[PDB]
A paper describes a structure:
Human astroviruses (HAstVs) are a leading cause of viral gastroenteritis in children worldwide. Recently the [name] ([name]) was identified as a receptor for HAstV, however the molecular basis for the [name]-HAstV interaction remained unclear. [name] is a heterodimeric receptor formed by a heavy chain ([name] α-chain, or α[name]) and a light chain (β2 microglobulin, or β2M). The viral genome is encapsulated by 180 copies of the HAstV capsid to form the immature HAstV particle, presenting 90 dimeric spikes.
To understand the molecular basis for HAstV [name] binding to [name], we crystallized and solved the 3.4Å-resolution crystal structure of the HAstV1 [name] - [name] complex. Consistent with the size and ratio estimated by SEC, the structure reveals that two [name] heterodimers bind to one HAstV1 [name] homodimer. There were two complexes within the crystallographic asymmetric unit, with the most dynamic regions being the membrane proximal regions of [name]. At the ~ 570 Å2 binding interface, two loops on the HAstV1 [name] wrap around [name] residue W154. The W154 side chain sits in a hydrophobic pocket formed by HAstV1 [name] residues A469, V472, Y475, and L509. Similarly, HAstV1 [name] residues V472 and I512 sit in hydrophobic pockets on [name]. The negatively charged [name] residue E138 forms an electrostatic interaction with the positively charged HAstV1 [name] residue K467, and it also forms a hydrogen bond with Y475. The [name] residue N136 side chain forms a hydrogen bond with HAstV1 [name] residue D473. The remaining hydrogen bonds are between [name] residues D153, W154, and E156 sidechains and the backbone of HAstV1 [name] residues K514, N511, and V472, respectively. Finally, the HAstV1 [name] - [name] binding interaction is capped by β2M residue I21 contacting HAstV1 [name] residues V472, D473, and Y475, forming ~ 40 Å2 of the interface. While these sites may be important for interaction with another host factor, [name] does not bind at either site but instead binds to a largely non-conserved region on the side of the [name] dimer.
Numbering used by the authors:
A (entry chain E), B (entry chain H): 430 to 644
C (entry chain D), D (entry chain G): 21 to 119
E (entry chain C): 28 to 290
F (entry chain F): 27 to 292
Write the structure that this text describes.
Amino acid sequence: EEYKVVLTFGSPMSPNANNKQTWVNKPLDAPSGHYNVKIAKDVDHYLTMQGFTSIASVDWYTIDFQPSEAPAPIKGLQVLVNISKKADVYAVKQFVTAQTNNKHQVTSLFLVKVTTGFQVNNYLSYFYRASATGDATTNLLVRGDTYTAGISFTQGGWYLLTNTSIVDGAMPPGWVWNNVELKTNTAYHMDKGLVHLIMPLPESTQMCYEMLTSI
Amino acid sequence: EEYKVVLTFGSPMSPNANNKQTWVNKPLDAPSGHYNVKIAKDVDHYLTMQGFTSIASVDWYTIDFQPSEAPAPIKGLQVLVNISKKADVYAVKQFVTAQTNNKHQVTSLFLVKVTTGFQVNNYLSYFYRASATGDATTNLLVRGDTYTAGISFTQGGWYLLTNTSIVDGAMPPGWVWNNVELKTNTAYHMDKGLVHLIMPLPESTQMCYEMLTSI
Amino acid sequence: IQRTPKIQVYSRHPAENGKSNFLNCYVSGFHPSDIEVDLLKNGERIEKVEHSDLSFSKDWSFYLLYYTEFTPTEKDEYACRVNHVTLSQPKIVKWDRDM
Amino acid sequence: IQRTPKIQVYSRHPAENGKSNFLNCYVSGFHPSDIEVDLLKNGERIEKVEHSDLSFSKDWSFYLLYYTEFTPTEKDEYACRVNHVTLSQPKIVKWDRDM
Amino acid sequence: LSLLYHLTAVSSPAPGTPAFWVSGWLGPQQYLSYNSLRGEAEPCGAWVWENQVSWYWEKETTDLRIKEKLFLEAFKALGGKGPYTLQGLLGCELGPDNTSVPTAKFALNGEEFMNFDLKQGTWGGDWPEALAISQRWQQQDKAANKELTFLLFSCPHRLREHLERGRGNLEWKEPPSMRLKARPSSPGFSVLTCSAFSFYPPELQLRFLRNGLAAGTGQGDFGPNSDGSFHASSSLTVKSGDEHHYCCIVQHAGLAQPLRVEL
Amino acid sequence: HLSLLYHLTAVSSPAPGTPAFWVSGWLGPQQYLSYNSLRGEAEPCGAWVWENQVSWYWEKETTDLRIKEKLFLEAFKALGGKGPYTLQGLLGCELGPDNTSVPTAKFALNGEEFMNFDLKQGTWGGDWPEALAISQRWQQQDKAANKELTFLLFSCPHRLREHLERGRGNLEWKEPPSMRLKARPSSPGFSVLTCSAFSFYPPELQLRFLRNGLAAGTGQGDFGPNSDGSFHASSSLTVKSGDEHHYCCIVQHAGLAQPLRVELES
């Protein structure tokens, strides 16, 4: 079930550009009349899409980098908007990084394939970090003001969707289903799931990720 | 002579920490009485180390992801501190990102192995990006203020060293040897050679790079 | 999903001391539907309290109106105590006559 | 490395009109050694221009003193043309009587 | 105007709590009420006075009995572990040329998960529970046609009938009783509270004015009244001692010209 | 403190009629020697032309520099690749605090320090490739190692000791500066004040602006030499328009024991 995936990145999706910050959906609600993208198992276990980035190609390998054949959609996981489905999840991956003893940063990556074209208007923000004076530890934060914009998904295209949540207190044992919005004025650590959300990577960049096809 | 390298990241090097920005060496000079790390071919062709990061493991694969054995050091390339050698270069890679016109960003990656432990005091800086208003494009910049600090390299260890230069004007055809400092009030685009320098990635993170063993 | 309740305490008419009025404790935007509401006179559960029909708003969050008939004095203190699955300990809200 | 030259133009004794003095053009911190310096009188190369020996400072960059005897007038402008491998077009620096 | 049915079933109700209840709304006015305990649709508030025929309320009760059945059936098809809160928003809004536009949405545990698709004559949704519940309801005899009539005939006819019988109930106009007050909650910054106290319809606007100039609108709070009327209140934080030079402006429908309130 | 240092420079493709190799010898901050491939003779400079140094002394220096001329030009050959090349050398010794010689032997190729002389093993050290080439080539010369060893561990200290007897007065020269605190309007609302020290020695001069007798900051200072070994310095400051007065430039040079106060001139 575990597979090493080589994602070959595509071109930035609007409103993102190669010379702009990477925009991501901050809150868990949407502008009046639209909806968030949700990667879901059921009404009680789902995560809201924050980071959107297009994958131009997917190469599949076993855990020794020996080629494998493209697995089938993960049963039970799907990308939904309001009541309709829009995409299949082919591989999942979570990154649990202990910011503190209790504070945990959980980043989830979803490699989906769109099955029905669609669009959403979401409240977008970006990552920023203010300069300091001296060795002062400046934190990585999310901007508070949101900029409403439309994100468009093309059918049959591969997309890499992301959700980061800060899980306080004690930590569950398995897949973290905590759907927390990108709290403003809250510092975030980098992990492998986030390198592509600082600025849009140039087309044809490759990243290999160790993913699973089951929860 | 082209190999896909899977690097397994180690712990941050002082002054970097998992919860602080990544410090990188800003200028091409050093505090009085110390020196920069230079990855060099000859006195005329060398690049100043800006980004430093320790690699805990290196696994070698062919350009098809078929296992390989660790090649021999690239002959002719060496990490030179002052007039003394300190490491062998085992694999290199350059990433050319076209910023607008008459400007190219060249990020260079050197997978070296230290042969003589050493210390250097460099003028370090970080990447910052100020919050803005609306869909205004905020740039990724390098701070002007530098913080002098010591960087320590332990013998026999693997290291990933980086140099980014903004090449103004016409472009050579082969390896770009422009040793440019990290310019303040200059905007930088992201490429794969820079994703590990926003914040230190958590220990044991993995990255694969398509690197060469010759120039 | 699970939503914490929003509590507002007010009077039906301006709080003229010595005349009869209605105290409303309006709890809104909670989920699920089960909630514990007590109007309170100086820390005392007012037994003569009637509630409206448990409804929900367009965002699928429930709302309720608890109310009681009363006559305000210049010395009494009315409050509204709510307990919900989302509240660790019951929240309390005092009735400012300004509202 | 290739270092761009730093050009300073000043007079030997306090700039006084009608009184013989020396115009110096000091070129410093350059590399490589070949450099082209011309003193200029209202835009003309003075043929009677003498210089020092090419020396270098502690960072291995070269420095040079070009000098000529001259007499300042009320209406007159002296400057220094330097060309080096690092300059696309020859740089020019005017002598203000301040220095 | 719009006729809306707010249906709620809980898989584990409290003792003495109806495991099913409905509240019917004509615009912002509660008129109908049902629950599993009494099992009968009774009028509300001032709809006990409209000249409704006597069987009308029995016919309503029979419709809501069918719905009580269906909603309680769904928890069965759910599977998984409890508890569940199944909700339903069923209605119709009279568009401009007697063109009723129906509404049929359903929310499971507070997540909108289902609809009724008239194009396909069936309950739709892609959440797994949406599929389960929708299949189960699709196999319950004529439930598809019961809902189809509830949205395309039963609801629009009831609306037109209620409108003719409720014209006065809908043209209720009670203007607000305003009370601009001051509170020194913050040190060096007193908050001004404007309050409209009993009014209907709920459309009311509160502005603040600084010395006859436009000072803004405060934090707005809004709620019902024990008589089906509404209450509104706005709070604005101003510098201590400038309160005197502040006025509150209320624009309600029951005031023919917007009212001005002082301290 | 006192240091005898030689500045050697060889160029692989010298200009027409230009020496391909030249040396300057320095006592402290004063040039005493000059050599080149053309004249091939070590000649005195400045006030060292009146030094009682015997001709033999200067002959010995000229022969040493002929050997260095050879090694340096030999380097370019052993380098390979295409030119141009500029080989520089800093060879000397410093009188340490306790009458001890500190040798100095650094070499820079194309302006990049790449080579040194390791007194232990008498070998040229360096890891840049050109360092290896030049070093092997020089290691294969006629006791070139022993000549460099002696020039660093014996000849330089002895020459230093003598030069301190015969020419000590040359180093303690003292010529005080002639000042001028002119004022120039930088832009509407501001004015740049220029304080200019004109002919002085030793080179160490400190300028400080004063604001109505309070401490002000010394502004952008630029500094350079003169044909006669004297120096010129000038500092600028941007002050409010009309506040040009209430400003006095205080200059501190070895020539003046009491710090001098300069004022604007009409």
